[PDB]
Structures are given as structure tokens and as C-alpha cells.
Symmetry: none
Subunit: 197 residues, 6 copies
């Protein structure tokens, strides 16, 4: 069990980013959302099947990457999602606390990003544009799944733009853009959330 | 000469969108930008060559379509971009006014788009994401090259988000997202810009 | 109103194929499914919005192609889908029978396809694989949206494999694979379904 | 029958370019290569099946395009490929000279291409890279399938680089790069090759 | 030498899957098929060159991924393929047994997969589609190359559908779909095949 | 921060610059420009390096790749002083000196003489640079960290008449493919290996 984290309600940009990029059943803002990462990757199919047979949740994500596998299930009813999470933990025979604790590989604020840099960031991103002169928050977590918690709590806490989030792979990466003050608040919220796991 | 439109200064989102999609030298906001659409599209390489050998402009775009060809050249110095444009028009043996006059084919404001619909829009888009509940402006131009004018002027006129712009084909398509009030102003600015262009 | 076709229940392979290629809310087998193709295409966003604001349907497909636009909406409740259809027709200010009557443009059965040909078919397809020696049904419809009706009814009628279906463009194209007799039955049902559609 | 051209032996770069882009059985240099373009395109699967059932040829290419269809079949032995053509001509009730006689719609040499322009060309190309300062030959043929003859004979006659070739659509497009002298010879050989083709 | 496995005759779905996804000279059902995986990845070009210079085999696959390299060569004549393999081993100065023995990290049957889950599996797959209500066999091997043996032997033994096989990467993954009993017979034959190779 | 790669190229050779321009996501260079490559871990932290170089100099970035584990930056300018000023800024920022970089090691280096057509066809289908043609020799080089592969490419191209087939200077291992005559490949390989060995 690499990642296990429950989002009580998806913020609009995160839900929209998942919808623009994920392969599965799109979530909408406000739905509860549970994320589960495990190894080996292909074995996530066992987790998905358990959750879907037990509850009415819908999966936005089942990724099997080089080494790991990641699942998202969602529903407008928090308890329906939480019911799916309990089922998953029973199938895995581990409790919520047996999850790997998230580590922050990088947390940095880059002020007044130059146009040359935003152009490359943006060409590699599918979320909101970072525009020249905006501040950039970059967060790298390990394992990758927890990046969504940082993204959701940051968006909840400040007026910022979700540029990109990658909650799978060796490392989970998050890009936010906004004014310096809003990015400061978004960064504080994201970090306070990762450390609360 | 189908399209010959000079943008005095690229607005930030349009410049960023070009940075996301162009296959040439990426621009940056504030640069002057000339877009030239021609028929036949195979001659675009000769037009590009004329502009580049005469001036210091950098080309963000050269698209050879099934019929039409599109070029973008830019520079911070408007003089470089207009020098390139003059070179092009003189080679084509046309005057700027000889360009096709653009027409607003289709224009629609869709208020408070539902979440389901913002997903299909977003998955077909590379610009800003439209969020559920935002209003959507959809514009079609003929010829298609002029859609970058609608995008640039809309962004100048209103606090809207550029979701996507496609300035090549028979019709140029533009998608903007924002509040209803912002989209109202962006829509009018986009349409007023298209109709302000003299030509054939 | 180019295409307007109601599918009472999505067959498993067609629903799975939509799940593979659609950029909207993926459907599941057994759901009612309405497909709407219009000209001008760009106006599909207004059609989609009207259906989503009026009903609980979810959209699997919204394709802005070139001159046409295609929408799919679905729901397990046939009533919600029919309600969305009437909402669309009223928004378009047309009646169902005002749709273009579809025509079988081309229909072919290739018996016992060679391995060298199945490789190329499969590389241009996202559905089931056609295996060497299986028969291949190739269908073209006009308008293109009705191709999903041919696919759904063929799967209803025969034990065949959905290789690929493309219900957007000037002609809709369908590829099915299976034994000769089953392909004969699939082609019959697909062609009959197309001819059973009323329109102009 | 739009295109019917027999290439006695694929030249190395053209064979390599096909290997890079085709979705069938990759050829190698020196093999005989027959290219068949037909209308309607959807009938191409039926022509492919006839050729494969009658001979040992392997198909590198089968593209069904919005109007036309293109097939490539090849074999180390010219006879096999000629046998496949003989079968295709019999299946079509047409002779070799019943093909459309191709014509050179466009032919341009752009000398000393600027670095900015070679970038965009290269990002839209899968063959050899054109390097800054090299000359660029741009040819268009109609029917499009004959563009591979222009490519094969240009490569036979001159030390030039195949940048890209597209043998389908309304026009076949050929981009070559090299020194001014090499490109001059390649252009003349290409144009002569197309002129040497008989047909309606 | 990470993977070295010989398939006497490619089954139809496996051959077709290779044909739809591989970058190379596409094989056809019935051809003999040899798979070789090594590290360093880029060094697979030496292996390919030896096999092609010595025999008439055609390569369906030469993948250079993050870390490893994978080759497939095939021919209707098992003799050409076996001659190509021994040439490879001769050039590597290795014997067939010096290969890493494949492990079985994941092997699971998921019965009656829900439509939500099949839609995702399918959107990530290029083989046959798994349909809602079918059973799913999932198998992971290390090294990845050996997945093709499980696929070929599974298809030979049971009426199942090849959904996907990825014989390159850190781990070789196999997805089969079908009825539960047929999937059980397929899994039986696949697992027996994997653990029956020395190394 | 771990400084995996730091290497300065005095002048980009034509094929390398063209390959960067054909493949990279950024502001793409032209031949003759000075080029600095910086690879670090953690991957996303490359953004700090980029920011420091851009805020202090006029360099433009051709590359900022954040892959599975590492991040790679390229900055370039015709004035070597701008590029070296950017490099000094980066090193001062990272608080490391030039020689604190990970020393590159020639991992795999091999020449494959007279490559068969079956093999070139696969290599080419997996490559974006020049073609390798059957019968040409192939130089394959692996480097660790991957960033230093560009030095081998540039010096190999400077030293011999070879073709850049592909270079991947990011990932776990940096890989270089060159094609040419046996003798030209021999010289290119020697020049490439000597350069890598000479990095402190």
C-alpha cells in the first residue's frame, strides 16, 4: 500500500484536470474522491474490483505504470466513497495507517517566472496556463499518489491555478501558478496537508 | 492571399497557447505577430523563405493544409514584422487590402456550462481549462487565419480564458471561458475585430 | 439535422468501443443512447447544453469534425434519453422525421481475410482484432452518425466482433469480423437497420 | 484506377521512409514495389484481398482516405509484384494505360533554406532532416500516388535526401533536400519521371 | 541475458497483437518466434545483427526502453529461428541456461469484471476487448520478456481473448479475458509454462 | 540537489541543433550557437536552475525535461559569454563548482558494421534524426548520466562525416546512434569516447 488518501470534496480545477487527462469515468467538482496506490502495478485491478462490487463508486483512474498502480474512486456521497475505502483495506488486509508516509522531495516557490520558462512548462502541461510574471509553486512528493491531496487543499486554500499534477510514477509532481501572496498561502496549505498524513 | 492580419502585440494567453501548439520558434507575450494564410498551401514555404531572408522575424507557425497554407512570423519590433509582411505581399503581387475580408460565420454564448460538457471541451483543448458553471464563447471565422485576431482582441478586451483557437482550415474556431459578463465583452470585441478588417 | 438515431440499449462491444475512443462520460452496456449529428457542426455545443440542462443524460461524445458535429447522450432510463432528444429537436426547431434518411453507400464482405491484410486493418482500428481467415464486413453510411445504428443492430443479430466504427465525417464507416455466416447475418441486420430509418 | 506505377526497385531512402511510416509489412531497398490508387477508397480492401489471394506479395501500405484509397505491394521478385498488378488490373477491368496520366502541378526549389524554416519543416517530417543552407525541392503530383515515382527516380538520379513524401490525398507531396546541384538534378529527374508515365 | 525463450508456433491472437503494436516486420500465425531480452538496453543491436547476418529470420521487435532491450525474430522454418538463437548465444558466449529464470510476481483471476473496470482496461489496451462480466487473468513476470510464453501457451490451451501483453519494461504484464473456467485453463497452462523454464 | 550533468558546447553542430529543433519542447536552437546542458535531481527542481539562468542572462532554453526521476536544462545563445555567464550563475546558485558534477562514463560503446535492412528499418522507425541506410555502420553509445550524450553527439559530428540518427540525453541512460561509413563511424566513435573520458 503506497498511497491511501481521501478527499472529502474535489475542488473545481482538480476535478476538471482529472477529467481532461484521466482515462476512466470523469469526476465532477464536489464529489468525494479516494486515491489508492499499490505495488505491484497490475494488482490494482484486484482493489478496483473489490470497491466496485461493494459500492456505487465510479473510478476516474486506474493507471498501471512502469512499477506501480493507482486507483481513484469517487461519488457525491462521502460515506459511499468511505465504504469503498474500507472494502479496499479489508481486501488488502491493512489499515489506513499502514500506508507509506508521504515525503516531500521538493517544495519551492519561483517568483515572476520568465516567459521562456512558462512556455516550456505550459507546453508540457494540460492544466491552466502559467503566464509570465506569475509565481510558481513546485511540489514533488514520494510516493506519487499523495500529490492530489496537496493539489486539492492548495486550491481550497488560495486563489491559484492548477497547472499540472502527476500523481503516478516514481514521484508525484504538482505545479501551481498565481500571485506571490496566493501561492504562498497555497504552498503552506499543500505542505500542511502532506505533513498531516 | 486569404488572410493577412497583423497583431500589434500578442496577449499573454494567446502567446502561451501558440507556445503550446506551434511547431516553430515559440513567441512570447508583447511581440508583434503577423499571420498569413494563402492558397495554394504548398507555396507557403516560398513565402516563409522570402520573409526570413529579408527580416529578423522568427516563425512560430508554418502549416501546410490539404489546400491552404498558414504562416506566423513575430518580433518585438513591429518594423521587422511589417517589413516581413510587405515582403510577402510584394512577392504575392497583392496589396494588404487584397486579402479576403473575414466574416463572422458562427458566434454563440453558452451560459453556465455543465460539468459533463466542460470535460469534452477540455479534452479537445490545449489552452486554459473551462470550469463548470463558466460561460463559453464559440466563434467561427472565414477564412480561418483571422481567428487569432478574434482571440487576441478578445483577450485584450475582457478577463476571459483562452480555451482553444484553431486558425487553420476552412473555418477558424475560437473557444473562450469566463464569467457571463466577461464573455459578453469578449464576444463583442472578437466580433467587432473581425468586422473591422478591410478586404475583398 | 443530419443524424438523429435512438439506440434502445447499447450492446456490449459497441459500448466498450465507445469507452475506448470517446472523450466524454463513458457509457456501459444496456444504456439507452441517442446520437445527433448536425450542420453547422460547431453548433453542437448548444445542442449538448440544452440536453444536459433539461435532463440527467450523460454525454459520451461531442465531436467537432470539420463541417458536422456529433453528440452522444446516454442513460439507463430510456425516458431520460427520449426527453433529451425532444429537447434537442425543439432547440433545433426540427422534428425527428426531418432528419436525413440514411443510405447504405457501400457494403462489402471480404471472406477469409489474409494475415497480411488483418495486420493493416488492426493497426488502423481500436476495437476487436480481426484474426486471419475471418470474414470482414465493411459498411459506409450517409450520414455518418447512423453508423452506430448499424454497429449496434449487427451486434444484436450475430456473433461477430466490432473491429472499428467511425460515426463522424462525410461517410460513417463500420468494420466487423467473424465467420462467414455470422458476418452475413451481421451485414443483413446492419443494412436493414439503415433502411428502416425514416427521414428526408 | 487513379495510380498504377511499378517501381522496379525501391531506392534506399524511399524504402526506409516507408519503413518509418507505413502500417503494413515493411519493405526493404531493392524490392519491386507496385502502388495502386483507386476511387472509391473503401474498395481498397477488396483490391488488397485480390492481390494477396493471387500472389505472394506483402502490403506495406493500405490507406483508406476520405475519397481515395492507396495500396502498396512489394516482393523481392519483380514477377510476384507484376503478377499482383496483372491481377489487380484484371479485377478492375482496366489496363495499365487506363490509369490517370500524372501531371506536375507544382515544382519549387527554395535555395539555402534558413535555419528557422528547416526547423518547422523537420518537425513536420519523418525522413531525412533538411539542414540549414541546403536547397529544398517541393513537388506536387496528381494523382498523389505517383509521388513515390518522383521520389524513387529523384533518388536514383541525384545525391539528395528524402525529407518527406505523402502519396495520398488530392496531391502527392515530395520534399527533397541537398546541395543546389544535387537538387537541380533531382528535380529534373523527378519531373521527367512523372512526364514519362503514360495513361489517360 | 535477461530473457531467452523460443515459441514453436505463434498463436493467432498473439501474432495479431504483435502485428498491431510492434515496430518491425510483422509476424503471422504459425511462425516460430524467438524472444531475447538483455541489458544494457542499447546493446540489443549487437544481438539483432548477429541473428540477421547468420539467418533469414525477420525481426518483429527491437525495443530499447528505459533500461533493457528486447528482440523478437521469427520465420516459418523453426530451423532458421533455432539457428538464429544459437548464433545469438554463441556471440554472447552464454548458454541457454544462463538466462534469468522468470518469476511470477502477480497471478490473479478477477471474476465477472464490472463495466466500470473493463472500460478502463480496454481504453489502455490494444488487444481484444474484455467485456463486462468476463473474467480477467492478470500475470506479471520478471524479466518482462517471458510474458510472451504465457500468452502463447495460454491461447493454445483455452478459448480466451488476449487483451494485452507487454513483454518489455521492468515487468512483463499479461491480460487475458474469457469465461472463468476457460480463464482458469489458460492460467493453468500459462503458469505451468513460466515455471517450466530453467535459468 | 544533485548535479548530474553539466557540459558546455562551444558551438552546436548542424545535425545536433536540427535534431534538438525537431524534437525538443522549448526555444529551439540553430547551428553555431553555444549550448549548456544541466541535469539534476530531484527532477522538478530544474525549474530553479532555469529561473536563475534566465533572470541573469539573455540565454534561451531549448530543453527543460522533467522525466521519471531527473530534470535536464539546455540554454543557448550565439554569444558564448551569455551561455557561460548562465552556467556560472547556475553553479554559484547550486553552491557547487563545475567539477562537482557526476563524472560521465562510457558505458556501452559499439560499432555494428554493415547493418542489415531489417534492423535499420526498426532503428529508423524508433528514431527522429537522419536515416540509417542498409549497409552503413552504426555507432551506439550509452552514457551515464544521460545529459552528457549531447557532448558525444556534438564532438562526433565535428570529427567525422556521419549522420545523427538519434540522441536521448535524458532518462536513466543517455543514448547516441550515429550512421555512416565504417571509417567515418570509427572516427566519430573515437571523438565521442575521448570527449566523455575527458570530463572531470
Amino acid at each position: 500500500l503506497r498511497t491511501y488518501i481521501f478527499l472529502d470534496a474535489l475542488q473545481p480545477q482538480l476535478a476538471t484536470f482529472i477529467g481532461k487527462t484521466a482515462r476512466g469515468f470523469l469526476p465532477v467538482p464536489g464529489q468525494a474522491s479516494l486515491w489508492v496506490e499499490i505495488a505491484p502495478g497490475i494488482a490494482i485491478n484486484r482493489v478496483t474490483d473489490a470497491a466496485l462490487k461493494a459500492t456505487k463508486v465510479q473510478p476516474a483512474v486506474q493507471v498501471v505504470e512502469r512499477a506501480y498502480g493507482l486507483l481513484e474512486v469517487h461519488h457525491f456521497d462521502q460515506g459511499e466513497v468511505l465504504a469503498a475505502g474500507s472494502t479496499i483495506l479489508d481486501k488488502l488486509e491493512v489499515r489506513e495507517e499502514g500506508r507509506l508516509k508521504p515525503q516531500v522531495m521538493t517544495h519551492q516557490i519561483i517568483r515572476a517566472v520568465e516567459a521562456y520558462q512558462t512556455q516550456i512548462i505550459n507546453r508540457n502541461s494540460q492544466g491552466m496556463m502559467i503566464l509570465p510574471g506569475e509565481s510558481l509553486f513546485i511540489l514533488e512528493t514520494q510516493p506519487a499518489g499523495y500529490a492530489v491531496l496537496a493539489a486539492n487543499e492548495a486550491e481550497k486554500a488560495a486563489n491559484v491555478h492548477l497547472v499540472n499534477v502527476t500523481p503516478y510514477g516514481a514521484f508525484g509532481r504538482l505545479y501551481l501558478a498565481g500571485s506571490e501572496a496566493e501561492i504562498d498561502a497555497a504552498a503552506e496549505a499543500a505542505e500542511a496537508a502532506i505533513r498531516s498524513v
